[PDB]
Short mmCIF file of C-alpha atoms and ligand atoms in Angstrom, two decimals:
data_model
loop_
_atom_site.label_atom_id
_atom_site.label_comp_id
_atom_site.label_asym_id
_atom_site.label_seq_id
_atom_site.Cartn_x
_atom_site.Cartn_y
_atom_site.Cartn_z
CA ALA A 1 -0.01 29.79 38.03
CA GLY A 2 2.63 28.79 40.65
CA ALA A 3 1.99 25.34 42.21
CA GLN A 4 -1.47 24.93 40.65
CA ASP A 5 -0.60 22.41 37.91
CA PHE A 6 1.35 20.34 40.40
CA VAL A 7 -1.60 19.84 42.79
CA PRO A 8 -3.46 16.59 42.03
CA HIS A 9 -7.31 16.36 42.05
CA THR A 10 -7.33 14.39 45.34
CA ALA A 11 -7.98 15.17 48.96
CA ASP A 12 -5.83 12.30 50.22
CA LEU A 13 -3.09 13.86 52.37
CA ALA A 14 -0.56 11.15 51.56
CA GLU A 15 -1.11 11.63 47.80
CA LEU A 16 -0.93 15.44 48.18
CA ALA A 17 2.34 15.18 50.14
CA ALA A 18 3.91 12.91 47.53
CA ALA A 19 2.88 15.30 44.75
CA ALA A 20 4.33 18.28 46.65
CA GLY A 21 7.67 16.41 46.62
CA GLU A 22 7.56 16.93 42.86
CA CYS A 23 6.40 20.56 42.89
CA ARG A 24 8.38 23.15 40.87
CA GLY A 25 5.78 25.95 41.39
CA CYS A 26 8.54 28.38 42.46
CA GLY A 27 12.33 28.15 42.72
CA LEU A 28 12.58 27.07 46.36
CA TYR A 29 12.45 23.35 45.56
CA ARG A 30 15.95 23.57 44.08
CA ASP A 31 18.16 24.11 47.18
CA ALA A 32 15.81 22.53 49.75
CA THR A 33 16.24 18.86 50.67
CA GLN A 34 12.58 17.97 50.24
CA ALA A 35 9.10 19.42 50.52
CA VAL A 36 7.67 19.49 54.04
CA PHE A 37 3.97 18.88 53.87
CA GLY A 38 1.61 19.12 56.79
CA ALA A 39 1.31 16.61 59.61
CA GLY A 40 -1.91 15.31 61.07
CA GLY A 41 -5.16 13.85 59.87
CA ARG A 42 -8.25 14.98 57.95
CA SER A 43 -10.42 14.53 61.08
CA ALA A 44 -8.61 17.49 62.66
CA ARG A 45 -10.89 20.42 63.61
CA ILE A 46 -7.92 22.82 64.07
CA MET A 47 -5.43 23.58 61.31
CA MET A 48 -2.29 25.57 62.24
CA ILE A 49 -0.14 27.26 59.58
CA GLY A 50 3.41 28.57 60.02
CA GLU A 51 5.68 30.28 57.46
CA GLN A 52 8.00 27.58 56.14
CA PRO A 53 10.02 24.58 57.31
CA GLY A 54 13.30 25.54 58.98
CA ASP A 55 16.66 23.78 59.08
CA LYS A 56 15.51 20.83 61.25
CA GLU A 57 12.17 20.44 59.39
CA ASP A 58 13.90 20.40 55.96
CA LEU A 59 15.75 17.21 57.02
CA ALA A 60 13.04 15.66 59.29
CA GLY A 61 10.27 15.97 56.68
CA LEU A 62 7.91 17.21 59.41
CA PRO A 63 6.82 20.65 60.57
CA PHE A 64 7.62 22.37 63.90
CA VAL A 65 10.29 19.94 65.18
CA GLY A 66 12.90 22.53 66.20
CA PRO A 67 13.02 25.18 68.95
CA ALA A 68 9.95 27.08 67.72
CA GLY A 69 8.09 23.73 67.65
CA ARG A 70 9.09 22.98 71.24
CA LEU A 71 7.79 26.39 72.37
CA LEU A 72 4.58 25.79 70.39
CA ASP A 73 4.22 22.39 72.14
CA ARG A 74 4.54 24.15 75.54
CA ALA A 75 1.80 26.63 74.49
CA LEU A 76 -0.50 23.91 73.13
CA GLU A 77 -0.10 21.88 76.34
CA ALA A 78 -0.91 24.95 78.49
CA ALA A 79 -3.97 25.55 76.28
CA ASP A 80 -5.05 21.86 76.74
CA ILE A 81 -4.74 21.15 72.98
CA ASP A 82 -3.36 17.76 71.83
CA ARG A 83 -0.92 18.37 68.92
CA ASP A 84 -1.78 14.87 67.66
CA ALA A 85 -5.35 16.10 66.96
CA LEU A 86 -4.23 19.12 64.87
CA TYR A 87 -3.27 19.47 61.23
CA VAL A 88 -0.02 21.48 61.21
CA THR A 89 1.48 22.94 58.04
CA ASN A 90 3.22 26.01 56.58
CA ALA A 91 2.48 28.67 53.93
CA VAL A 92 5.55 27.58 51.88
CA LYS A 93 6.65 23.89 51.68
CA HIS A 94 10.35 24.29 50.71
CA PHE A 95 12.92 25.84 53.10
CA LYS A 96 14.32 29.14 51.83
CA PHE A 97 17.70 29.73 53.41
CA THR A 98 21.32 30.82 53.47
CA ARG A 99 24.38 29.98 55.61
CA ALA A 100 26.62 32.53 57.38
CA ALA A 101 30.31 31.82 58.00
CA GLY A 102 30.73 30.57 61.58
CA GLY A 103 27.01 29.79 61.56
CA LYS A 104 25.59 26.98 63.68
CA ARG A 105 22.67 26.46 61.31
CA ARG A 106 21.02 27.27 58.00
CA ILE A 107 19.21 30.64 58.38
CA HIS A 108 15.61 30.95 57.14
CA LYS A 109 14.98 33.77 54.68
CA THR A 110 11.50 35.35 54.37
CA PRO A 111 9.44 34.02 51.47
CA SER A 112 8.45 36.69 48.97
CA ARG A 113 4.71 37.35 48.57
CA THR A 114 5.31 35.85 45.09
CA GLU A 115 6.49 32.51 46.58
CA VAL A 116 3.62 32.55 49.12
CA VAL A 117 1.05 33.02 46.32
CA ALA A 118 2.84 30.35 44.25
CA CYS A 119 2.56 27.82 47.13
CA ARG A 120 -0.96 28.78 48.28
CA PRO A 121 -2.64 26.10 46.06
CA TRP A 122 -1.17 23.48 48.46
CA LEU A 123 -2.71 25.33 51.48
CA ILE A 124 -6.06 25.43 49.62
CA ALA A 125 -5.86 21.68 48.92
CA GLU A 126 -4.99 21.02 52.59
CA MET A 127 -7.96 23.11 53.75
CA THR A 128 -10.25 21.35 51.22
CA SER A 129 -8.93 17.97 52.46
CA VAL A 130 -9.16 18.67 56.23
CA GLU A 131 -12.21 20.99 56.33
CA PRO A 132 -10.98 22.59 59.56
CA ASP A 133 -13.44 24.50 61.82
CA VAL A 134 -10.66 26.97 62.66
CA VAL A 135 -7.25 27.91 61.17
CA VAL A 136 -4.50 29.34 63.43
CA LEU A 137 -2.15 31.59 61.46
CA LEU A 138 1.23 31.59 63.22
CA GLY A 139 2.95 34.76 62.19
CA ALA A 140 2.92 37.42 59.47
CA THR A 141 3.61 35.32 56.36
CA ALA A 142 0.90 32.72 57.17
CA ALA A 143 -1.64 35.35 58.22
CA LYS A 144 -1.00 37.43 55.09
CA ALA A 145 -1.36 34.30 52.93
CA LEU A 146 -5.07 34.18 53.75
CA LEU A 147 -5.86 37.73 55.01
CA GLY A 148 -3.92 39.87 52.55
CA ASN A 149 -0.37 41.21 52.17
CA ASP A 150 -1.24 44.34 54.21
CA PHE A 151 -2.57 42.33 57.17
CA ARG A 152 -0.92 43.13 60.52
CA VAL A 153 -0.90 40.26 63.09
CA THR A 154 0.07 42.78 65.79
CA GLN A 155 -3.21 44.71 65.31
CA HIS A 156 -5.65 41.74 65.35
CA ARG A 157 -4.34 39.45 68.11
CA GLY A 158 -6.68 36.59 68.96
CA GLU A 159 -9.63 38.13 67.12
CA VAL A 160 -11.86 35.56 65.37
CA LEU A 161 -11.80 36.52 61.70
CA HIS A 162 -13.69 35.19 58.66
CA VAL A 163 -12.94 36.02 54.99
CA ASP A 164 -15.05 35.00 51.99
CA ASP A 165 -12.42 33.43 49.66
CA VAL A 166 -11.24 30.73 52.09
CA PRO A 167 -12.55 27.11 51.65
CA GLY A 168 -15.34 26.13 54.09
CA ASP A 169 -15.35 29.64 55.65
CA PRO A 170 -13.45 28.45 58.75
CA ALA A 171 -12.77 30.85 61.58
CA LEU A 172 -9.27 32.35 61.36
CA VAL A 173 -7.13 33.34 64.34
CA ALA A 174 -3.85 35.12 63.66
CA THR A 175 -1.21 35.00 66.34
CA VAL A 176 2.46 35.58 67.03
CA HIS A 177 4.94 33.16 65.47
CA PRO A 178 6.47 30.89 68.16
CA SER A 179 9.98 31.82 66.87
CA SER A 180 9.33 35.40 68.05
CA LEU A 181 8.98 34.16 71.65
CA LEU A 182 12.38 32.41 71.69
CA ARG A 183 14.41 35.58 72.19
CA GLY A 184 13.94 38.98 73.88
CA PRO A 185 13.53 40.34 77.45
CA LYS A 186 12.16 37.66 79.85
CA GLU A 187 9.06 39.68 80.88
CA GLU A 188 8.27 40.40 77.21
CA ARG A 189 8.65 36.72 76.23
CA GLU A 190 6.45 35.64 79.17
CA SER A 191 3.68 38.13 78.33
CA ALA A 192 3.84 37.10 74.67
CA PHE A 193 3.66 33.38 75.55
CA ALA A 194 0.54 34.05 77.64
CA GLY A 195 -1.04 35.79 74.65
CA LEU A 196 -0.26 32.85 72.35
CA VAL A 197 -1.96 30.51 74.88
CA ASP A 198 -4.96 32.88 74.93
CA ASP A 199 -5.15 32.89 71.12
CA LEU A 200 -4.90 29.07 70.94
CA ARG A 201 -7.76 28.87 73.49
CA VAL A 202 -9.90 31.25 71.39
CA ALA A 203 -9.33 29.00 68.37
CA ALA A 204 -10.05 25.83 70.37
CA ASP A 205 -13.28 27.42 71.70
CA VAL A 206 -14.66 27.96 68.15
O1 URA B 301 7.52 24.10 60.50
C1 URA B 301 8.00 25.17 60.88
C2 URA B 301 9.17 25.31 61.71
C3 URA B 301 9.62 26.54 62.01
N1 URA B 301 8.98 27.66 61.57
C4 URA B 301 7.84 27.60 60.81
O2 URA B 301 7.23 28.61 60.45
N2 URA B 301 7.39 26.35 60.52
S1 SF4 B 302 7.76 26.36 47.92
FE1 SF4 B 302 5.67 25.56 47.35
S2 SF4 B 302 5.29 26.38 45.22
FE2 SF4 B 302 7.52 26.58 45.62
S3 SF4 B 302 8.44 24.66 44.72
FE3 SF4 B 302 8.03 24.32 46.97
S4 SF4 B 302 5.98 23.32 47.15
FE4 SF4 B 302 6.17 24.27 45.06
#
C-alpha cells in the first residue's frame, strides 16, 4: 500500500504537500527533516522528476537547490526553458542518507525499488494535479519509477516514450541525472551536458 492511504482526494498542490509532510508510507520520513514536495504550478506543461531531495533540499523544503540544481539551471537556460514554468519534483519525498566521518555533507543513499513504489502515489497525484504534456525523468531511479525497474536511461537517451499506465499519457523523456555531470573528465562532462540540453529541448518541443 505504501503512501496510498496518506494521499488526500485533492489535486491542490498545497494540500498535497501538507499531507506529504505527514506521510509514513515507508521508513524514510523518520530521519529526514521534512518531506520535500514538488515546486511549481498546475499550469506547467513540463514536469521534471529527480530521485530524492539531497542534503540542501531536506533543509530548504524545495527541490534542486544544491549543486545538481545549479547545473540543471544552466542546462534549462541553454535550452531556453524557464524553471519558473516547470513543475519539479522527485520520485521519493524524504531524503535517505548517511554521514561519513570527516564528511562535509550528508550523503544520499539510493532508494530501494520498494521505497520508490511506496512513494509513487505522490508522483501519480502530482501528475493528476498538473496534467503535464511531457515528463522529464532525470536519472535512473525516476525513469524506472514510471518505465520499469529494468529500464536503462543510457540506452534510451532523449527518445520520446509513452507508456499506458501513466496518467494523461504524457510524453516521457528520460535523461542523465544532473549530479552525474558534476564530476568526471572535462570533455565527458561537456558532451554529457550538451546531451542533457538536447533532451530538454526534445521535451520542450513536445
Ligand atoms: O531535488 C533534488 C536534488 C538533488 N537530487 C535530486 O534527485 N533531486
Ligand atoms: S519517502 Fe515517500 S512514501 Fe516514504 S515516508 Fe516519505 S513521502 Fe511517504
